[PDB]
Each structure stands twice: as C-alpha cells, then as structure tokens.
Amino acid sequence: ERPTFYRQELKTIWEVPERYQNLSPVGSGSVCAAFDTKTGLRVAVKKLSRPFQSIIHAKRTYRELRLLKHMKHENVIGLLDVFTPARSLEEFNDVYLVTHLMGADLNNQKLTDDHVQFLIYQILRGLKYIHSADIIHRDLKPSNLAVNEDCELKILDFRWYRAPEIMLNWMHYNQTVDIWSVGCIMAELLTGRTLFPGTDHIDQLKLILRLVGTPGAELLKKISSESARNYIQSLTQMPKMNFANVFIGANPLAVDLLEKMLVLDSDKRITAAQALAHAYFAQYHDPDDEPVADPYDQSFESRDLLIDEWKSLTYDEVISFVPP
C-alpha cells in the first residue's frame, strides 16, 4: 500500500513517509539527514530540485534514478528508497531519493600503510563493480568517497585528481581515467599532501609531466591532431622521475602500484580488476568476493524525448522500485 506522509517546512515543504523522522537539513536538490524508524538507520533524504523543469532536468532526474537503482555493491552508494507524495502520474511533481547517511569523506599525523591498503582496496573493489557495468565515474576525488566509523568506504555521487588525457584535449577515454584518480588519492593518503596541486590546467599538466615523463613516441603515435602533437613535443622534455624519491619510506609495493596507476598512456594503465590482485592488497584480496555488476543500459543517453516522456519513464522507475 501507500505509507502515511507528513509535511513540514525547512526552505521548501517536505512531504515524506512517516517512517523518516527528525529531518535536519544538511545542504541545498536539498538534503536532510533523517532517522529511518523501519531500519534504525541514519539516512540522507534528497529532494530533487525542479526535477522536470525542462527536457534536460527531466533526463538528468531519470539518469540519476536509473544509476542509483542499478548500483548494488558494498562499496558503492545505492538507493535505499525513492518516493513521491503523488498518487498518480498527473500529480507527480516531486521525487525524493534516500541513501545511507555517511559520516566523513576522505578529506581527512598521516595514515598507516595497513589503513591506506584497506581504503584503496575498497575503492578498487567498488570501481571494479562500476566499471564492469560500463560506467565511468570521471570525477573521483576524496570528497566523493565516504567512510563510516569502522572506515568502511562507499563511492559517492558520480581538478587535482582528473586524468591528464582529459586536461589535454584527447578523447581516447578509458575507464582507467578513474584509475589515475585513485593513484592521486593513494599518493595523498601516503604522504599527506596533494600529489598534483595545479593552479590552472597548464600548471597541473606541467606537474604531472615532471613526474611521469613527457609522452614517449609510442603514445605520440596515438595523438591524431597536428597542433596537439606540436604542443606536447614543444614542451621542455622531462624524464620519468623516480617514484621512490617522491614516496620516501612508503611500502615498496605501494610505490610499484603507483607506477602502474600513474601512467600517462591509458592503454597501459592498470585496470581495477588487475589492481586488486596486486601484491600490495594481499591481506584483503579475495577473488571470490569481488563481484561484478549486471550490464547497464545507457542507450537512453542518446535519446531525444519530450519532458512528459522522461517524466513518465521516471514515474515507471519510482513505482517499480524494490528495497534491498
């Protein structure tokens, strides 16, 4: 059946099932932290802002709901509930999404090696899943990575951490753009400092190239633009520096993994599935507890529909929702 809803203000009117109590705002969609009386869980309740204002809003609402419904993995945030106070598609105007309320993010002495292993392991386990659905995160960074008390980690809400192929204007994009971001995060966890703290995208690329080397002829054979090639080969030619000398006293397997992640050529960068099997994660690696996702149908992405059709498609997904 339909739950009983109650309304309150705090500055839109929120109308939510009565199982969610003690709503207290935590950002502006806009999000309230709440107590889920059914489960005794702390939850985030996000009320989408203007979800069907235009074709672009409606499709983004649909894309967000579809993605969250698909994600079913310990290290990836999924959907705990989705509701609307509307009793039919005609009154359907508001969408609310409920997810685990996570404490800290990774913006956060420094960490021990065992604890860096554990956190990166979790990130890679989550990424293996996401990537197996043919999803690329694209913007992994310490603030999209949430942790509870026991520092169990979940990947959230999908330029110091972005792959250089993106900051150059190359478009040979692997899912390993996310593996670059993990490499930068791991380095920051290991040393306490941002690995590539660029002021603009140019400054950033300079710092990157200083560490990894200027592109080799083999990667240069992959650049289709004359100016682009001209640009890279115009830059002062930097040798690959030694990673050990940047990561002093780091566990040497950490350094070895880093050298595999922080590779300029994306086709040569270690993948998530491969990183998990690397000796650095020995103590956590379980190849039978690193599950993959069902295939994820993003064909909708290329479709040009009407607001009312994206809306109805969204309503179909709300109705058909089943809790974990």
Domains of the chain in sequence order: 1-103+293-324 (3.30.200.20), 104-292 (1.10.510.10)
Task: Report how far residue 59's alpha carbon sits from residue 49's, in angstroms, rounded to the nearest whole number.
Answer: 13
Residue showing tokens 């200083």: 210
H/E run at residue 45: strand 41-47
In the annotated binding site for ATP, the residues are 26-31, 46
Name the β-bridge partners of 89: none
In Å, what is the CA distance from 287 to each residue of 7, 78, 273, 291? Answer: 47, 23, 9, 8
For 31, the 3-state DSSP assignment is strand
Spatial neighbors of 204 by CB under 8 A, at least 6 apart, are 159, 160, 164, 167, 196, 198
Let me know: does 23 contact 33? Beta carbons within 8 Å: yes
Q: How far apart are the first and last CA of the chain?
A: 18
How was this structure determined? It was done by X-ray
Number of C-alpha atoms within 13 angstroms, CB side, residue 69? 19
H/E run at residue 68: helix 55-70
Let me know: does 314 contact 58? Beta carbons within 8 Å: yes
287 by Cβ neighbours in 10 Å (0-12 / 13-18 / 19+) ranks as exposed
Residue 145: alpha-carbon gap to chain centroid = 7
Residue 67: alpha-carbon gap to chain centroid = 12
**Which residues are the active-site residues?**
157
- Reference 145, options 176, 184, 103; nearest CA is 103
Number of C-alpha atoms within 13 angstroms, CB side, residue 182? 33
Which tokens hold the place of 249? Answer: 């006293």
Let me know: does 231 contact 242? Beta carbons within 8 Å: no
20 by Cβ neighbours in 10 Å (0-12 / 13-18 / 19+) ranks as buried
H/E run at residue 279: none
Which region, left, alpha or beta, applies to residue 153 given φ > 0 means left and ψ of -120 to 50 means alpha? beta
- Reference 142, options 104, 115, 179; nearest CA is 104
